[PDB]
Amino acid sequence: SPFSVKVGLAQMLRGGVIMDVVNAEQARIAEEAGACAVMALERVPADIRAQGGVARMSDPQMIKEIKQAVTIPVMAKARIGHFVEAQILEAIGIDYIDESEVLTLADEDHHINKHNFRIPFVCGCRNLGEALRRIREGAAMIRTKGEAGTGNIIEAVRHVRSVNGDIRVLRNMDDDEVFTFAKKLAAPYDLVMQTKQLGRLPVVQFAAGGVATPADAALMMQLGCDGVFVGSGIFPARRARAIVQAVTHYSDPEMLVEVSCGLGEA
Amino acid sequence: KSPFSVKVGLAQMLRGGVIMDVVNAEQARIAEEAGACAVMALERVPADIRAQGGVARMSDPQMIKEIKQAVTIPVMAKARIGHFVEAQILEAIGIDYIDESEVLTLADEDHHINKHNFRIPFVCGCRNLGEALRRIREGAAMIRTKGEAGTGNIIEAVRHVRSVNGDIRVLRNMDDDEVFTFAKKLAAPYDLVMQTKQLGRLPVVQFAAGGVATPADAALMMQLGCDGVFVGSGIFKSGDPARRARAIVQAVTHYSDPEMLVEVSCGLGEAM
Amino acid sequence: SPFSVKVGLAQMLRGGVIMDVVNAEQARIAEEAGACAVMALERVPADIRAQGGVARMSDPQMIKEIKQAVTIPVMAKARIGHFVEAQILEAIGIDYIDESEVLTLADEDHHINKHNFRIPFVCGCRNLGEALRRIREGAAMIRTKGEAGTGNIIEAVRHVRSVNGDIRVLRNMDDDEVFTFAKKLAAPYDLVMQTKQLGRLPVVQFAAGGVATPADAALMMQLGCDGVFVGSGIFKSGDPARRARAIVQAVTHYSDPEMLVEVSCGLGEAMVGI
Amino acid sequence: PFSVKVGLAQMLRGGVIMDVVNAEQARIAEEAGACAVMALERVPADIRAQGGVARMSDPQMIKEIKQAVTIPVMAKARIGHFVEAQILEAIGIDYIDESEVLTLADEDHHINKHNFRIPFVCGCRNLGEALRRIREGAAMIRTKGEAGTGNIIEAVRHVRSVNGDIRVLRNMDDDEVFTFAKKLAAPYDLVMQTKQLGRLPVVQFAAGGVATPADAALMMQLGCDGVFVGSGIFPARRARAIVQAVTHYSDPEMLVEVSCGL
Amino acid sequence: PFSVKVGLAQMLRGGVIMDVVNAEQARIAEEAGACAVMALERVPADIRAQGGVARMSDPQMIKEIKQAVTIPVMAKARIGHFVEAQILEAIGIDYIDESEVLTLADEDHHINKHNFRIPFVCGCRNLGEALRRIREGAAMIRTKGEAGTGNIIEAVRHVRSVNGDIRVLRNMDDDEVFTFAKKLAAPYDLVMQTKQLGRLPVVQFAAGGVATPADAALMMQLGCDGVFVGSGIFPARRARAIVQAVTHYSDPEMLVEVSCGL
Ligand SMILES: */C=C\C(=O)[C@H](C*)N[C@H](O)[C@H](O)COP(=O)(O)O
Ligand SMILES: */C=C\C(=O)[C@H](C*)N[C@H](O)[C@H](O)COP(=O)(O)O
Ligand SMILES: */C=C\C(=O)[C@H](C*)N[C@H](O)[C@H](O)COP(=O)(O)O
Ligand SMILES: */C=C\C(=O)[C@H](C*)N[C@H](O)[C@H](O)COP(=O)(O)O
Ligand SMILES: */C=C\C(=O)[C@H](C*)N[C@H](O)[C@H](O)COP(=O)(O)O
Ligand SMILES: O=P(O)(O)OC[C@H]1O[C@@H](O)[C@H](O)[C@@H]1O
Ligand SMILES: O=P(O)(O)OC[C@H]1O[C@@H](O)[C@H](O)[C@@H]1O
Ligand SMILES: O=P(O)(O)OC[C@H]1O[C@@H](O)[C@H](O)[C@@H]1O
Ligand SMILES: O=P(O)(O)OC[C@H]1O[C@@H](O)[C@H](O)[C@@H]1O
Ligand SMILES: O=P(O)(O)OC[C@H]1O[C@@H](O)[C@H](O)[C@@H]1O
């Protein structure tokens, strides 16, 4: 099925770090550091937060400059519900569209119908019900969100523990009780049952928002994420490598010490 | 081809019919002779349950068997909501349908019976499209859209039939992209919302139940888009049940014939 | 340890029905119907609820008459926190004390310190936190409670699903999260971990409250209970001696619908609940 | 006569109406392919920032804009200010927009637009408002977002609201339409006309927050007949890009071309 | 193994743990007689003033402090940030303080401290919190005031609260302890251990607002085993004065001597 193929593409990012970049030079630095993919954008979440204004899809010209500067997959953000921005991004030839909460919401009631697209989408969530709803709309990959731009991991921890804890609860739940659980999640029952049978989210799950240090990144992996997004926490060429290392060797405290030592200001 | 689809097909056979509550073999015969498509075996009518109080449970298997042996039309029986053992007993009796019913005392306030675990088809109630689709996903092969049971008052059945059928009509022309949020707002499975959208009607047979007291009430439910009606109190708590039973059966069969509606309503006696 | 021995003792009741009785003849009917034990009392819960007044421990005389009329274990109820009522019951030589919510509370803030007694106690609960607190106080067996005297199974279903649902959540829970779980249950961490390791309550768990029909009793078994208490459902019904047998056979054959049909068929009038 | 005004407005279908503040901007708008210009002295984003009372523009600056292009010229009048409307009509312009972005002149009543020879455009946020404006004599409806913010969210909300109600109305049980008209506080006859047509009885444009070619094409894919743009443009390149996006709204390749490096 | 960690922490009894930000401060602390140092990059008073997210310090600055003294070296990790704890343990320090003065990393769960070889210090404001921290594996408890304010009032409140509850527990009817443990939301077995010991089952220090020798001696007279000081000191004279006050807390003459002209 076309969806299962998109899900397989995102599965190739497992164990990786996706980095926000604002030009070709940052793109190369992320790639040279070992980022599994780059997120092309005009201003990072820490800047979106402090500057205000409306934040939209980046200029196709800048996205193309990044796409041609690197060989790892390139993602780009579209406003939630802005299915025309996603049509443009898909026409550029990028590899992923991230329907992103850090951009200004375009549709308060509806997300993009992602099954209408050929390229895979990333969507955000804060709980299992939201994740399953995004998946049913066609998301091939899920970002479990903290507070973007704050450098503060607390909400990412909260939401990762919430998503993974609900999955664990679902695992040994009385089958007769799953119907009500799906109602309370306001989630599609078939996806709830798929999650119960897998014992994990039916697509790749990365943590995103507030990942500032190698310890933060390894913490997300130890709590069960498949990878991390980092935006502000890097841009710096040395900090990118350390976070990549922290994610690859998240259970090695010796490696975590080495990359954290003398790393500079976060 | 699927087991659920076969159960759905069984309930299709009841389209255009009247299902009557009966409390003994004699009333079962009156129901069948008047032309009911099925009988609902129970120990107290919903009007008696409403007045008397107490806990209302599955009927004694003995009395159900006496009803099944007295008629050739299908026999249904009620189980309390969530009481899957009552349903196991009912199925082991060999009746044709189990009605997981709100008029008996709730056994489980948070969960319904997992009806897929049974081979015989279930009827469940609803008051809105979300509830209907949830019951269907749990395995109901047929849906009662409920009014007030035992009151003789059609107002809630009209409200809920209009609500269920109105939301189905809204679904028909709805932007496909908005259906995901609609399913969320309904707390209903998205696949079943889409099936209702594609069908333009409920994915299973939809009867009205609750407060149907007169031939005009019964024909009103059919004109509003129901496939049939349940009647409990309106027949046997009235003056002449056998006459009123036929009158209601005729009204459902000929719901668009005002001449027929007059003839069966004329001189019919006291309603409940 | 002494507590482990009392816990082991009550394992013998698994698969059984414990029946409330108010005289020696009722006890003889319970035993002959196949009850695993009798609960001796002066008023059944349906009568306590309707009549009012203060409900206390029964006269030791009537308890002795019941104990000598049967060979199966005899239980008797003490008011919650009334440790002297329990001292008296232990001196009578009965087999179990049930510290029971259906009697009038004697102590609103503290239960009986059940470790001070040689005989095992049954306590009630409505959730996993309560069950683990009762066990820590020394209960050797737990009643997961519905509404006594109503013939309505809804609260027992609610509470059985709650206790067992929390145990299932606990089984798979991240170890690092159990400390907070114990805090939010207000339950002793060591018992929470024991429950997590066992995947069930550390003591025998029966359902009690509102079991009126064989179908109700088998339902409690299919929901995971080890047995049921019946008080009002038997002797406040049409034919108690036949209904007692039917409920015993429903608990033994809870997964057999043909047997449930047979014992339920023509069983006469069940209790008039509320 | 109303149907004549309604038919005139149908000529704008598929177009971009740009706000302009001088003859030169008017000419750039026209040359970029705008279907009409909206003459004013303050752009909506400057109306928001500066504050103050905002009114009909000087007839002198409106005449200059009118003389400087051949595409229709619109101008705004305060809501309920039927005298500003009389002056604009006497100027000889083509459309009057009774506009919520000027200071409200009458909080309880709109202009009785049937008293005028030239067509009017009114705003709305929901189907009940659109039909009331139409019954008052609006020949064209602007489904409004937040003017001057560059944020499309409310325009998306209001466009989805108006069109979703129309879709609901289309296959509603006729017997239930009387209550629907009451709940909308809308004239029953216009509700039935809308139900029978399956769309709004006049041209419907989106307005408010349309900032990028992607926004404009989004409004078209959601079912609008066209879009207004005010702050979004002033520049001849961005104006042409939005015109192109509205003309070719289902073509992602064209949307990339006009958006690239903009 | 937990009792080994508990016994190690008992060596600190009667001591002052000072916060330090470099090797030199560490040496001044040690020479003034501190029983241990707490390595960090921002003092609590500067954490309050500056704001921002506060985290585990760079392992490089912690190693330098560790190399610069022979008394135990502690370092802080964010609450629930078990990975920061893994890094600190890999550094080879002596104690990890799971500290409320860093930004909370996990609002619902603390570090499962039993998974670590080295002892942990946790904070508390009441006996229920202290016992929960201990059940999680804290070998030492800080009864907290307001960090970085120099105001002793909350430390006095929390010390009186913990010790008063212990005194109440000591002669409580055994039958009532089950409900007491429930009300504390604390493990019943630790509640009984506390009742039988007549004191907290681990070393208890005061921390937060200890500004003067008089404050430090007050904490000792209220029943603490020692005190933490962060902002209060940085200077070698004030550090020695607080060490002296803790060592000789019942001697008013010594308290005058070290306080005079300070
Ligand atoms: C919630 C996060 C997002 O929506 C965006 C799209 N993810 C970002 O690209 C960053 O990776 C997360 O932000 P950060 O600056 O790391 O806090
Ligand atoms: C809501 C109705 C029901 O749950 C029951 C099961 N249906 C009854 O059998 C009757 O047909 C409806 O009750 P009535 O006495 O007709 O009002
Ligand atoms: C909650 C139940 C109790 O506390 C008592 C002690 N159990 C009774 O003996 C009955 O078995 C339960 O009451 P019932 O009449 O069956 O509802
Ligand atoms: C709601 C919009 C209006 O009332 C005005 C009359 N329309 C304007 O001319 C603009 O086209 C919309 O404002 P914008 O600056 O695009 O947000
Ligand atoms: C509550 C105090 C803490 O969490 C930290 C870890 N303790 C500090 O090291 C200081 O000793 C207390 O702060 P102070 O500046 O003395 O108020
Ligand atoms: O509840 P649903 O509609 O599934 O999703 C809610 C999220 O969608 C967006 O508006 C926001 O990001 C919000 O958090
Ligand atoms: O909301 P759900 O769980 O679908 O069903 C609620 C209905 O189920 C039963 O408890 C009652 O009949 C109630 O009306
Ligand atoms: O565990 P705790 O909360 O102390 O006990 C609660 C129960 O104890 C008695 O008061 C009542 O029966 C109540 O339900
Ligand atoms: O149709 P009604 O409700 O009268 O008009 C509402 C609008 O009329 C004007 O005052 C404002 O623009 C407001 O939004
Ligand atoms: O014992 P619990 O209540 O879980 O812990 C409370 C403390 O845990 C941390 O979040 C804060 O320091 C808070 O004061």
The three-state DSSP-derived secondary structure of chain E is CHHHHHHHHHHHCCCEEEEECCHHHHHHHHHCCCCEEEECCCCHHHHHHHCCCCCCCCHHHHHHHHHCCCCCEEEEEECCCHHHHHHHHHHCCCEEEEECCCCCCCCCCCCCHHHCCCCEEEEECCHHHHHHHHHHCCCEEEEECCCCCCCCHHHHHHHHHHHHHHHHHHCCCHHHHHHHHHHHCCCHHHHHHHHHHCCCCCEEEEECCCCCHHHHHHHHHCCCCEEEECCCCCCHHHHHHHHHHHHCCCCHHHHHHHHCCC
Question: What is the rounded CA–CA span in Å between residue D24 and residue D64?
Answer: 10
Using alpha carbons only, give the angle D117, D118, D122 rounded to the nearest 5 degrees.
125
Pairing of strands D203-207, D140-144: parallel
Cα atoms in the 13 Å half-sphere on the side-chain side of C46 = 23
Tokens, residue B57: 């449970």
Tokens, residue D119: 């067509």
Chains that touch C (3 or more CB pairs under 8 A): A, B, E
Q: How many domains does chain C have?
A: 1
Question: What is the rounded CA–CA span in Å between residue A169 and residue A164?
Answer: 9
- Amino acid, single-letter form, for residue C178: V
Question: What is the rounded CA–CA span in Å between residue B150 and residue B157?
Answer: 12
C175: chain E residues, CB-CB within 8 Å: 112
The answer to whether D153 contacts A82, with C-beta atoms less than 8 Å apart, is no
Q: How many CB atoms lie within 10 A of CB A71?
A: 8
- Amino acid, single-letter form, for residue A184: K
Residue labelled with tokens 């190698």: A214
Question: What is the rounded CA–CA span in Å between residue A62 and residue A60?
Answer: 5
Closest CB to A136: pick one of B176, B177, B190: B190
Q: Alpha carbon C44 to chain centroid distance? A: 14
Question: What is the rounded CA–CA span in Å between residue D2 and residue D5?
Answer: 5
Closest CB to E105: pick one of A157, A218, A256: A157
**In angstroms, what is the C-alpha Rg of chain B?**
18
Per the CB < 8 A criterion, the answer to whether E157 and E174 are in contact is no
Q: Which residues pair with A23 in a beta bridge?
A: none
CA-based torsion, C40, C42, C48, C50: positive or negative: positive
Q: Is D230 annotated as a binding residue?
A: yes
| Residue C136 near chain E (CB below 8 Å) | yes
E103: chain A residues, CB-CB within 8 Å: 152, 154
Question: What is the rounded CA–CA span in Å between residue E178 and residue A213?
Answer: 44
Per the CB < 8 A criterion, the answer to whether B215 and B238 are in contact is no
Question: What is the rounded CA–CA span in Å between residue C4 and residue C25?
Answer: 34
Question: What is the rounded CA–CA span in Å between residue A140 and residue A186?
Answer: 20
Per the CB < 8 A criterion, the answer to whether B201 and B15 are in contact is no
Pairing of strands C16-21, B229-231: unpaired
Please report which helix (H) or strand (E) contains residue A122, including its range. strand A121-125
Per the CB < 8 A criterion, the answer to whether A76 and A57 are in contact is yes
Instruction: List the domain range (segments joined by +) for residue B26.
Output: 1-272
Do chain D and chain E touch with ≥3 beta carbon pairs under 8 Å?
Answer: no
CB pairs under 8 A between A and B: 45
Per the CB < 8 A criterion, the answer to whether A156 and A146 are in contact is yes
Per the CB < 8 A criterion, the answer to whether D39 and D174 are in contact is no
Q: Which residue of D has its CA nearest to B171?
A: D168
Q: Is A129 annotated as a binding residue?
A: no
Helices (H), B14-154: 25-34, 46-52, 61-70, 84-93, 129-138
Question: What is the rounded CA–CA span in Å between residue B208 and residue B146?
Answer: 6
Contacts of B226 (CB under 8 A, 6+ apart): B145, B161, B206, B207, B208
List residues of B with catalytic annotation: 78
Distant-in-sequence contacts of E84-88, Cβ < 8 A, 24+ apart: E84/A215, E84/A219, E84/E55, E84/E56, E85/E111, E85/E113, E85/E116, E85/E120, E86/A253, E86/A256, E86/E116, E87/A215, E87/A253, E87/A256, E87/A257, E87/A260, E87/E56, E87/E59, E88/E56, E88/E59, E88/E62
Measured CA to CA in angstroms, residue B257 lies from B143, B222, B223, B250 at distances of 26, 12, 11, 10
Phi, psi of B50 (to 5 degrees): -65, -45
CB pairs under 8 A between A and E: 66
Closest-approaching ligand to the CA atom of C106: 8
Using alpha carbons only, give the angle A215, A159, A195 rounded to the nearest 5 degrees.
110
CA of B201 to the centre of ligand 7 (A): 22
Measured CA to CA in angstroms, residue D59 lies from C4, D25, D52, D114, E13 at distances of 98, 17, 20, 22, 89
Question: What is the rounded CA–CA span in Å between residue B51 and residue C271?
Answer: 18
CA of D101 to the centre of ligand 9 (A): 12
Question: What is the rounded CA–CA span in Å between residue C223 and residue A256?
Answer: 48
Q: How many CB atoms lie within 10 A of CB C197?
A: 11
Which of C67, C56, C66 minimizes the C-alpha distance to C23? Answer: C66
Tokens, residue E20: 């330090």
Q: Which residues pair with B230 in a beta bridge?
A: B19, B209
- Amino acid, single-letter form, for residue D169: L
Q: Is D7 annotated as a binding residue?
A: no
CATH of the domain at A46: 3.20.20.70
The answer to whether B178 contacts A110, with C-beta atoms less than 8 Å apart, is yes
Per the CB < 8 A criterion, the answer to whether C110 and C137 are in contact is no
Q: How many CB atoms lie within 10 A of CB A262?
A: 12
Question: What is the rounded CA–CA span in Å between residue B214 and residue E240?
Answer: 98
Contacts of C105 (CB under 8 A, 6+ apart): C79, C80, C81
C184 by Cβ neighbours in 10 Å (0-12 / 13-18 / 19+) ranks as exposed
Confirm or reject: Cβ of A102 under 6 Å from ligand 1: yes
Spell out a b/e string for D26-45, using b for 16 or more CB atoms within 10 Å of the CB, else e.
bbbbbebbbbbbbbbbbbbb
- Rounded to a whole number of angstroms, the distance between the first and last alpha carbons of chain A is 43
The resolution of the experimental structure, rounded to one decimal in Å, is 1.9
Q: How many CB atoms lie within 10 A of CB D197?
A: 11
CA-based torsion, E87, E89, E91, E95: positive or negative: positive
B26 by Cβ neighbours in 10 Å (0-12 / 13-18 / 19+) ranks as exposed
Closest CB to A168: pick one of C161, C164, C173: C173
Which ligand 4 atom is the nearest neighbour of the CA of D146?
17
* SS3 state of residue B104: coil
Which ligand 3 atom is the nearest neighbour of the CA of C210?
17
Which of B45, B59, B67 minimizes the C-alpha distance to B90? Answer: B59
Question: What is the rounded CA–CA span in Å between residue C253 and residue C15?
Answer: 10
Closest-approaching ligand to the CA atom of D99: 4
Spell out a b/e string for B177-214, using b for 16 or more CB atoms within 10 Å of the CB, else e.
bbbbbbbbebbbbbbbbbebbeeeebbbbbbbbbbbbb
Residue labelled with tokens 């002779």: B33
* SS3 state of residue C14: coil
Per the CB < 8 A criterion, the answer to whether C255 and B84 are in contact is no
| Residue A215 near chain E (CB below 8 Å) | yes
The answer to whether A254 contacts E83, with C-beta atoms less than 8 Å apart, is no
Contacts of D201 (CB under 8 A, 6+ apart): D6, D134, D190, D193, D194
- Which protein residue's CA is at the shortest distance from atom 2 of ligand 9? D129
Question: What is the rounded CA–CA span in Å between residue E103 and residue C34?
Answer: 63
Question: What is the rounded CA–CA span in Å between residue C39 and residue A125?
Answer: 54
E67 by Cβ neighbours in 10 Å (0-12 / 13-18 / 19+) ranks as exposed
Which of D222, D226, D223 minimizes the C-alpha distance to D245? Answer: D226
Phi, psi of D14 (to 5 degrees): 85, 10
Confirm or reject: Cβ of E19 under 6 Å from ligand 10: no
List residues of A with catalytic annotation: 77
- Amino acid, single-letter form, for residue E23: A
Q: Is A43 annotated as a binding residue?
A: no
List residues of D with catalytic annotation: 76
CA of C86 to the centre of ligand 5 (A): 52
| Residue A222 near chain C (CB below 8 Å) | no
Minimal C-alpha gap between C151 and chain B (Å)? 7
Question: What is the rounded CA–CA span in Å between residue E172 and residue A167?
Answer: 44
The coordinates were experimentally obtained by X-ray
Contacts of A129 (CB under 8 A, 6+ apart): A185, A186, A187
CA of A133 to the centre of ligand 6 (A): 9
Residue labelled with tokens 């020479």: E31
Measured CA to CA in angstroms, residue E24 lies from A265, E31, E56, E88 at distances of 22, 11, 20, 21
| Residue B187 near chain A (CB below 8 Å) | yes
Helices (H), chain D: 2-9, 23-31, 44-50, 59-67, 82-91, 127-136, 153-170, 177-184, 188-197, 213-221, 236-247, 252-259
